[PDB]
Amino acid sequence: MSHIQIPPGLTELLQGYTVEVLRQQPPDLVDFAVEYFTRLREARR
Amino acid sequence: IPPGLTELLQGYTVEVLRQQPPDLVDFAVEYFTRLREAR
């Protein structure tokens, strides 16, 4: 009771976003997140 | 480290752990869009 599930690919997803933030230095991190993850999903097809 | 990066990562990550979404990137799009709209 009260186990936590860690899905596969969570760490990798976070890393990909974080590397882009630290290198590109976008001014708005939330705006960048929407754009980054939206493009990721579009490219997955 | 830029202002608020840790907070953004923690917020998303803890919600993944709490909610168990079926797809991580779908959830990311949804979660960050909500945040953008709330501001």
């Binding site: 974080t18 | 480290i1 990550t13 803890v14």
Partner: peptide
Amino acid sequence: EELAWKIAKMIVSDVMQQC
């Protein structure tokens, strides 16, 4: 949270250390 919070913190810290 409680355990979810603790584990999230652990995961985020690991990401920040690697990046």
